[PDB]
Design a protein around this ligand. Sequence first.
Ligand SMILES: [Ca+2]
Ligand code: NA
Length: 223
Amino acid sequence: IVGGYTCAANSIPYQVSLNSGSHFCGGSLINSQWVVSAAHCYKSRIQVRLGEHNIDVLEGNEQFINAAKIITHPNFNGNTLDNDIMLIKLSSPATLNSRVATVSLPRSCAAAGTECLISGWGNTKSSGSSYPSLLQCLKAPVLSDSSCKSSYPGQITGNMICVGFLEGGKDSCQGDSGGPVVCNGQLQGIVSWGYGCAQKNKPGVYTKVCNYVNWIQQTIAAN
Ligand SMILES: [Ca+2]
Ligand code: NA
């Protein structure tokens, strides 16, 4: 997250870290047994780390649980990044408490201008790289479907939204990938793609979660 702030410890209790030797992507706890993330985050081995604030130190609220099943959307396209969504089944259920909690799926798609919270352990530098120990947070609005489409001519499908700021300086980045965009208590976005991060007139592009509630519920029911 470029241009954000350090979240309060455990204030984003649905945020997970996907680990394979080190942190590589975010995800969101949506059921005791399921995490949703980005298909471009796919790896064949993943350990989900729940209840994190400092990914570099054990603080006592963590639950480390290996992925049992990893299911990319069957229409994921790695070129256009259409359908950039992935489900992870936990090998044992997460234990839900104040520090590890589910986030609601969308009841509806979000209006343009809806305020959201974007979080993760991605790059914090707009020039160079610095990967934080501590979970970063960003307040950002859903941009007009228009203002999204002007930024990326012919590249915004019906399954994508832009969230952020056209002036630059505030965005998700590499390593925030797969993480949450939560707007009025609903998971509306998954960190997906862009053109670098925090650049002028290049807002983050997010998987539009309100198109996927059927696919998510069907996939959970089937496994
Ligand atoms: Ca920790
Ligand atoms: Na971006």
